[PDB]
Design a protein around this nucleic acid. Structure first.
Ligand SMILES: CC(C)(COP(=O)(O)OP(=O)(O)OC[C@H]1O[C@@H](n2cnc3c(N)ncnc32)[C@H](O)[C@@H]1OP(=O)(O)O)[C@@H](O)C(=O)NCCC(=O)NCCS
Ligand SMILES: CC(C)(COP(=O)(O)OP(=O)(O)OC[C@H]1O[C@@H](n2cnc3c(N)ncnc32)[C@H](O)[C@@H]1OP(=O)(O)O)[C@@H](O)C(=O)NCCC(=O)NCCS
Ligand SMILES: [Ba+2]
Ligand SMILES: [Ba+2]
Lengths: 82, 175, 175, 84
DNA sequence: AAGGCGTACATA
DNA sequence: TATGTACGCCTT
């Protein structure tokens, strides 16, 4: 499709000048620079913001983890060797 | 008792996704329409439990992706030693068993199998825990049975540490 | 030659920081006026090697802090398996030995000591390697002697994986 | 996922920022946040991040996949390391 | 549904 | 006591 945007005169001119410095036309310049940005954002790991209460609990779990229980151990011993 | 006549593989072109039905519309849709694209082109990876006789038949699958827990400022932690702002984990986003194979312990084995895969990957990229996405209370209660702990806030998420998982896989000889 | 009559502590009040001189002003200056504040307020932790006879005498020190490696878009590696793009490491940003005892293998021991501390912290916050900043080529060559690998497009920075350090630490029974 | 922020600033500083927001033809929030986020990320990057080239990514991925054995110097140090 | 202002209360 | 978090109103 198309990208329709309203940009200030100072911004349009600056994109024009930079595209000019880069010996490339205005469409390849904007686009070829913004997909790698966009690709970095979508491939980045999801961030899970914890509250204070959950941080405390998670730090404590990672410090002193519980032992594996009967259900986990049973599943582990059934797991096939691949 | 537990069905053990299956092997694990990354989802590929060969596997029979159309025959897979777990009774949940969205999990079916992911496997059938989105799992392969995300596996080959994205950060979400999907692994399938395949029958050992007919090796295109999917008995179930899980998907895993990378995530980070952002700790909040807590009294005393800075002094406590080395820390990190963004603690790496792996999100177990999906876990599903085909209706024709439910009640045979395959779900539980896939969770250990996802743990095994994430620990092995974590050796090369970092990770301390599975962060588990639960659809509803009943699924959450199911994961809690394995020792996953629900988060207080955002309560349909549970944490299962690699240490806990590793002890179980170590004891059984899978790691 | 390996001096062993020393012990490790977090930097504290009772330790004579002004007597310490390793032949480098910044490292000396960091230990004297900054190491302390950052250790209990900030993100860089400083640990000192202290003489067993004169517990206030600093034979050496190192500072470690969390960091992350941001991987680039490598072809055929997306599908290659479960991974992530931000890989947790710990940065060994400073390592110094007092001139009064350079050449007695304390620096190599502080390197192993730093790797052990970071391996232990990584069990709770994640981490796969030490990222080592060298201030010049001679220092860089010294670190390379222990198996650290320089980065091509960031010489003066080296990587030493936790697997290599763990292999050394378990073999000697320190882990 | 939204939040809020409130900075006590001086009265003369506020005139400065409004004139600059005006010259930039944007509103207060836009100017403040579009100028402070770049400064912020540049700060965490230099402190906590190492952006790898493709060549170093592939090198480091190889090291971490199959790391060298500990060598004689590293082992000698591990055997010297005292345990308290 | 957000760029702003008013203004009292919770924390070093 | 000095932020900073919170009440919020109110137009755009
Ligand atoms: C949940 C699921 C993965 C379990 O697979 P499974 O092979 O049945 O798991 P197991 O057989 O290892 O243990 C399941 C046991 O818990 C019970 N159980 C599992 N999920 C349950 C649920 N959501 N509600 C109620 N009971 C449930 C089963 O009845 C069974 O009881 P039994 O084995 O003691 O007779 C499977 O039912 C499934 O595919 N559900 C749809 C996928 C799904 O809900 N995913 C949610 C997160 S993605
Ligand atoms: C690097 C350093 C820690 C080594 O201390 P060490 O481990 O006690 O030294 P080693 O036991 O490894 O032996 C080092 C060899 O170089 C020599 N050497 C060590 N430090 C030296 C120095 N500062 N200047 C010159 N020669 C030195 C030793 O005498 C020995 O020589 P040999 O080959 O004849 O035995 C120490 O030089 C130091 O503290 N330098 C300060 C600056 C610094 O450390 N920068 C690193 C952070 S970028
Ligand atoms: Ba079926
Ligand atoms: Ba001295």
């Amino acid at each position: 499709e198309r990208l329709s945007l309203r940009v200030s005169t100072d911004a349009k001119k600056l994109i024009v000048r930079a595209a000019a410095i880069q010996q490339t036309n205005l469409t390849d310049f904007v686009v070829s620079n913004i997909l790698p940005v966009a690709q970095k954002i979508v491939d980045a790991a999801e961030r899970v913001y914890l509250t204070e209460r959950d941080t405390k609990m998670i730090m404590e779990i990672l410090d002193n983890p519980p032992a594996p229980n009967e259900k986990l151990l049973a599943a582990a011993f059934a797991l096939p060797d691949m | 008792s537990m069905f053990t006549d299956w092997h694990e593989a990354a989802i590929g072109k060969t596997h029979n996704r159309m025959n897979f039905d777990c009774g949940d519309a969205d999990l079916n849709q992911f496997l059938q329409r989105h799992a392969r694209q995300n596996h080959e082109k994205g950060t979400t990876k999907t692994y399938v439990a395949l029958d050992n006789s007919d090796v295109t038949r999917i008995h179930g699958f899980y998907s895993v992706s990378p995530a980070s827990l952002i700790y909040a400022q807590v009294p005393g932690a800075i002094s406590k030693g080395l820390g990190r702002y963004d603690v790496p984990v792996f999100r177990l986003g999906r876990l599903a068993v085909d209706k024709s194979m439910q009640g045979q312990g395959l779900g539980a084995q896939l969770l250990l199998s996802a743990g095994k895969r994430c620990i092995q990957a974590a050796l090369q990229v970092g990770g301390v825990a599975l962060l588990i996405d639960a659809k509803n209370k009943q699924v959450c209660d199911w994961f809690k049975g394995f020792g996953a702990v629900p988060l207080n806030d955002q309560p349909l998420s549970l944490l299962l540490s690699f240490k806990t998982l590793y002890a179980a896989l170590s004891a059984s000889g899978r790691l």
